[PDB]
């Protein structure tokens, strides 16, 4: 059976309190998304709504009695993603054995299908990452900076 240890309940309580915005002690079923995320477990909105979560604001208000029985349920799912699936995945772009990826063709994949990102979030990607003269990005530094997160060594 699973429950939550010392640093797991302290972590959950800290973040719980951090989310109290009205000044009562409630959290929202919409806020659950970025809250579980803040706990450093990585869901889909599908994974969130599976344990009572909402599109809109202010539908159901969750307590600590509900929050901890979310996280204990969430500590079970195994498939979160690796690096290597994504290697093989993003090799499929190729046409000539380059491992490269033009920014234009790369914007369309971020927008079109899924949970999705915006025009705006794409303008953010094309702030940060290594183009060149023709305009290739490169899959190996790209995926690695995604998994590295905001600040590997450099960061802006």
């Amino acid at each position: 059976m699973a429950d939550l240890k010392a640093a797991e309940v302290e972590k959950a309580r800290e973040h719980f309190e951090i989310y109290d915005w009205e000044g009562e002690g409630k959290i929202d079923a919409r806020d659950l998304g970025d809250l579980l995320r803040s706990l450093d477990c990585k869901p889909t909105l599908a994974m969130v709504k599976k344990n009572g979560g909402s599109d809109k604001r202010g539908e159901k208000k969750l307590t600590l009695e509900e929050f901890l029985p979310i996280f204990s349920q969430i500590k079970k799912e195994k498939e979160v993603g690796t690096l290597e699936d994504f290697m093989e995945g993003l090799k499929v772009y190729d046409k000539a054995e380059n491992g490269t990826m033009l920014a234009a063709e790369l914007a369309h994949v971020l927008l079109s299908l899924g949970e999705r990102l915006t025009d705006i979030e794409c303008e953010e990607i094309m702030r940060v990452c290594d183009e060149d003269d023709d305009g290739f990005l490169k899959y190996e530094p790209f995926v690695k900076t995604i998994i590295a997160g905001p600040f590997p060594d450099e960061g802006k």
Binding site: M1, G25, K26, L62, T63, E65, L68
Partner: protein, 48 residues
């Protein structure tokens, strides 16, 4: 894994709940705080 909270629901579900001196709690869910039961005397009644 019997963290105090887990015990509340057991004590309501398994053969109390309907007995005339056991009263039902003030809802935890969409609420705030804690978990409990409620019981009765002649002089008054008790939040547990």
């Amino acid at each position: 894994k019997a963290t105090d909270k887990s015990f509340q629901d057991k004590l309501n579900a398994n053969h109390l709940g309907k007995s005339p001196n056991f009263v039902k709690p003030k809802p935890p869910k969409p609420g705030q705080q804690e978990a409990h039961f409620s019981i009765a005397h002649y002089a008054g009644t008790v939040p547990y």
